[PDB]
Amino acid sequence: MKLEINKFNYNDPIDGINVITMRPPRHSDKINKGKGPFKAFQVIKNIWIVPERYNFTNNTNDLNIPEADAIYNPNYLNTPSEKDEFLQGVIKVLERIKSKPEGEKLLELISSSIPLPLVSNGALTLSDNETIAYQENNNIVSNLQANLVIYGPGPDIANNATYGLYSTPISNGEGTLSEVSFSPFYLKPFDESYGNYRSLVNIVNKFVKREFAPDPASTLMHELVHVTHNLYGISNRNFYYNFDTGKIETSRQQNSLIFEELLTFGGIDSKAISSLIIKKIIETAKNNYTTLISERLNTVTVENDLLKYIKNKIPVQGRLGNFKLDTAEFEKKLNTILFVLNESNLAQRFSILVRKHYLKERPIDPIYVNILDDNSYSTLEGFNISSQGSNDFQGQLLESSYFEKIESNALRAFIKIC
Numbered sequence: 001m002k003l004e005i006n007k008f009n010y011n012d013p014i015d016g017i018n019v020i021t022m023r024p025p026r027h028s029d030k031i032n033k034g035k036g037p038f039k040a041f042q043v044i045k046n047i048w049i050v051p052e053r054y055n056f057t058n059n060t061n062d063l064n065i066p067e068a069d070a071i072y073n074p075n076y077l078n079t080p081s082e083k084d085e086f087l088q089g090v091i092k093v094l095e096r097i098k099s100k101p102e103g104e105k106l107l108e109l110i111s112s113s114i115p116l117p118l119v120s121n122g123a124l125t126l127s128d129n130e131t132i133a134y135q136e137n138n139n140i141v142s143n144l145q146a147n148l149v150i151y152g153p154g155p156d157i158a159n160n161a162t163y164g165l166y167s168t169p170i171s172n173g174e175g176t177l178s179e180v181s182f183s184p185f186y187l188k189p190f191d192e193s194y195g196n197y198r199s200l201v202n203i204v205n206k207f208v209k210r211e212f213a214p215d216p217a218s219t220l221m222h223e224l225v226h227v228t229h230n231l232y233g234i235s236n237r238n239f240y241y242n243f244d245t246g247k248i249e250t251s252r253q254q255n256s257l258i259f260e261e262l263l264t265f266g267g268i269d270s271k272a273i274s275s276l277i278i279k280k281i282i283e284t285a286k287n288n289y290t291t292l293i294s295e296r297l298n299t300v301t302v303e304n305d306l307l308k309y310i311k312n313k314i315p316v317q318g319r320l321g322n323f324k325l326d327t328a329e330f331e332k333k334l335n336t337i338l339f340v341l342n343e344s345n346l347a348q349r350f351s352i353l354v355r356k357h358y359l360k361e362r363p364i365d366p367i368y369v370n371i372l373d374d375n376s377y378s379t380l381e382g383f384n385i386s387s388q389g390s391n392d393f394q395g396q397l398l399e400s401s402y403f404e405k406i407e408s409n410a411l412r413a414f415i416k417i418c
Contacts, residue, residue, distance in 0.1 A: 003108050007092055008041045010051060010084035016134055016141060018042035023135040025128065025149070025165050025177060026056045037135040040157035041087065045111045047355035048132065049090050051083035053152050054181035055262040057163060065413045067187055069155035069404060072415035077152045083291045086152055089184035089216075089371055096217045096379045097224075102349045103217075105175040106224055106341060110148055113231045113313050114306070115175035116292060122301035124310065129166055129176055147179055148227050153183040157414070162218055162226035164235065171321035173185060173288030175233040184216045184371055185300075186406075189364040189398050190355040196392045211364060211398035215352040216371060222343040225264045234285050236260040248277055256361060265358040266342030285334055289314065290325050297323050351384055353393040368404045368417045376402035 005294050011020050021037035040050045053076070058198060063232075073222040099105040117124040123146075131143040153159060164170035165177045195206040229235045239259040242250045248259060262270060298321055300307060315329035346352045371377040378385055383395035383402075407415040 003098065003104060003111065005091065005098060005197065006041070006043055007091065008043070008087060008373060010039070010080055010087050012041075014039075014136075017417065020134040020138060020144065021136060022048070022050060022149075023133045023140070025132060025179065027340055029056070030055055031058065031061045033360040038285040039047060039083075040132075040149070040231050042144075042289045043094060043150075045105060046145050047107075047111060048146050048149045049087060050149055050151045051077065051086045051090075053077050054131065054154040054161075055178070056179070060181070063155050065411050067156060067159075067363075069158075069366065070412050071158050071186065071366045071408055071414060072412050073157050076157050076414070078163065085372065086184070090150060090182065092371060092377075093184055093220050093380060097221060097378055100349055103221065106221065106228070106346070109337075110224060110227055110231065112145060112309065113175070113228070114145070114309050115169060115177065115231060115233070116173070116296065116310065116314075117306055119296060122299070123304060124302075124306035126302060126306070127172075129169060148178050148180060148224075150180045150182055152181065153186070154181050158183055158186040158188050158331075160223055162223045162230065164230040164233070169233050170230050170235045171233060171238065173233040173285065173292050175231045178230045180220075180227065182220055182223060184220075186366050186368055187213045187215050187216060187219070187403075188366050189363065189403075191361055191364070192355055194393070196394060197397065212353055212393070213352070213367060213369065213383070213398055213400075213403050214349075214354065215384075216398065217350065218343055218347050218352045218354055221346050222264060225341050225343065228337055228341060229260065229264070232284065232285075233288070234334075234337070236263060236281070239270055243269075246272070246274060249397075261358055263338060264342055266344030267354070267356060267358075270339075270342060270344070271355060272295075281338065282331060282334060286325070286327065286330070293323050293325055303347065350382070351391070351393070352382060353396050364398075365408070366406065367398070368406055369402055373402065 004016055020040050022040040024032055025037045026032050038050050038052045040048050043049050053063060066073045098107060115130050117130055118127055132146040133143050134141045161181045163179045169176040189211050191209045192212055193207055194210040199206050236259040240252050240256040241259045241262050242249055242253055243255045315326040316323045317326045318324045336396045344354055377383055384390040384393060385395060407418055
């Protein structure tokens with residue numbers, strides 16, 4: 001069957017199927033006492049959008065004005081019109097991601113790749129690691145499957161992030177429900193070498209550094225790759241890559257980068273990872289998965305929809321009670337997920353310009369863009385619209401009129417858009 005995106009207005013009636021009031025997955029934590037429920041929309045099977053500010057961890061709890069390139073606005077995303085704009089923007093960006101095959105596969109992957117459930121009386125049974133709860137008048141009416149929840153931004157309204165729900169299943173092979181904090185309208189610019197612009201004739205070298213806005217579908221896809229790692233329970237978030245030694249560490253150092261971010265971003269730096277590291281990463285995941293088949297999956301004596309979901313997610317051979325990792329297929333899938341799927345590889349398939357290195361050399365103020373203007377941003381071509389002659393990334397130039405400057409005070413607070 002074809003993968004479908006559902007369309008919504010923020011004010012669509014609650015049905016308990018694709019429109020609910022959701023209780024935050026981190027409702028039990030102290031900082032989240034009494035928050036929610038929030039209105040939520042099942043854009044794609046097991047993928048939910050909540051037009052609310054992300055507010056559910058320690059560093060996102062306080063949205064006020066107290067990073068050199070942050071921008072703060074505590075009141076952003078708190079009217080119905082702002083919530084609907086957000087809802088439409090996120091849907092548009094998903095429509096863009098689906099428009100290419102590589103992006104369609106990614107989304108299909110996130111829809112179908114449920115975390116490994118617990119077992120109860122011989123049956124795979126859902127926990128709050130695989131579901132969210134529909135709350136109505138302090139009653140839990142139902143629990144509904146969810147692999148991903150996409151919320152608005154936290155304190156910094158141009159930052160994006162991904163959080164797994166439980167930290168043991170995120171790296172032991174089980175997998176875990178993920179939350180994404182995403183801002184489609186407020187983007188952080190980046191520098192890049194470029195020579196496809198009107199230049200004075202007397203200039204030495206046309207190939208100089210120029211400022212660009214990212215395509216917010218690339219931004220989101222970066223986060224969806226994290227989500228994919230989190231759903232397979234293969235997150236490398238506790239490891240650091242040391243650029244000086246070329247080796248993995250658990251403790252951070254002067255010239256390091258969290259290993260999960262290096263893989264997820266891709267490009268020239270991801271390509272310098274030694275076989276030695278690649279082999280251990282594969283190995284660690286094979287062992288974890290071998291263990292989970294033996295210890296958990298072979299305890300399943302009851303055939304249900306969750307079993308089928310799990311057979312499709314994890315390549316296995318054998319029969320009920322006696323399953324075995326189909327090692328070859330699993331290594332292939334693991335390769336697709338660790339090394340083919342990253343921001344840089346995906347961006348190339350979409351003709352989006354991304355920066356060269358994950359860590360940026362200098363901060364550039366964030367900007368505002370109404371990506372719901374089809375003249376500024378199209379689902380099929382982003383900002384690089386061929387009818388305007390933009391086939392070498394010209395539409396992402398920051399000087400483009402649709403990238404609007406934001407007036408901000410010394411404390412990085414939003415005043416207005418110029």
